[PDB]
Amino acid sequence: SAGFDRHITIFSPEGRLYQVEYAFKAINQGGLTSVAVRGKDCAVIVTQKKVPDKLLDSSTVTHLFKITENIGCVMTGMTADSRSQVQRARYEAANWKYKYGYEIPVDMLCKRIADISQVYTQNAEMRPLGCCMILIGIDEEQGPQVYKCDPAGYYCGFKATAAGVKQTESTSFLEKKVKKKFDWTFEQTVETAITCLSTVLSIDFKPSEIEVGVVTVENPKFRILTEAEIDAHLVALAER
């Protein structure tokens, strides 16, 4: 029955790899939560910020990073694992640019990093980097993409996704929003993401507890939403 949860490379009866699910729970162990939503020509990622004390430099506690000039990323889970994962992603993106001479698409980047994670989960020489990944970007002839990678090596495209402690409730709220079949303009995408986080946390957050990154077709550069712009967006949402 049990006792097979010790080694990553050990298949339990009924073919269940426990250690992978243990890493999936280590993702929630980070204590945070993030969501990503994609519109017709925009893709917004927004994550919660917890600051135990003003003693920290808030400019260096960012949880969303920049893989390339036009591909953004946000992650949750073990933060050191997250930083290693973004370092590997940047390496892979630049190496792809070198080898093939054009910018890495989001789908292929997620595929390659998920292949890396699968190789990690296949041999017992690694701990499988227990941190989730969410990438956003724009590709010609396809539009915006939102892509999620997990320590299991599973990657998929998402019209809107989530990660963290509130995975299930955020996904349910996003389901409720998506089944209404609405266009999701840029402002309304950001609004829906912020409302998702607020309702799933029930905090009605102050604007200083959030970082947002968006990518649009008119602004392919992965722009991190500064304090003034997030203030505008969420105060307008509060008044709207």
């Binding site: 920290l56 430099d57 050191a80 694992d81």
Partner: protein, 242 residues
Amino acid sequence: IGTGYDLSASTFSPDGRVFQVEYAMKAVENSSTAIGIRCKDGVVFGVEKLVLSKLYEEGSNKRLFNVDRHVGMAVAGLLADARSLADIAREEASNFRSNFGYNIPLKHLADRVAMYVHAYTLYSAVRPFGCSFMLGSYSVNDGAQLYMIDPSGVSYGYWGCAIGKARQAAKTEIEKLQMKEMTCRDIVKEVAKIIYIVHDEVKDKAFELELSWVGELTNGRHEIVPKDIREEAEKYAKESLK
């Protein structure tokens, strides 16, 4: 208690946590207390070094390394682990200088060393570095930064932080201190008195105080506090501790 899952650093727990990293956390928490504060134009460091026997020479087990000419190094935990970490950080800074031709930014050096200490966390044939260390630097075109990297591999930027058995106490005592305005002169005294109050005399006595800083006051160069400034800081600590 996590028995059966804490024997290796590559095995997760049902709660989803690597217990070897938490045990390194505990090892750091059971060590001496070191603090650092970043002034307007530089950073300063303070260490509560416990002299375990009077037989040791003054300055034995120097806990304030200097990774680069402009980069400080304050550590806590295992001294051997700390020396190995300082050595690999020095190697990383030297490689950065050799390849890129200019001084390594403190944020980039902290990122690289945190990546390395993480690489020593997720294996099974190695053990996580059981020491938390501080990083401080001052650049005229970049500014002054402070970074705390623990065996978990995380590298956050702190205004001024502490590591050791007096973590929470030094947090509370440094919160009331307003930090952003003054320079090293009006912060070394504060660091000295904080270190002298957090230390407990009834148990774990016989400690000596050592300070280091980097900034334009020393032309962006990390070095030990000069003897005159050290003794005036000690005098301020004595008068303030009454």
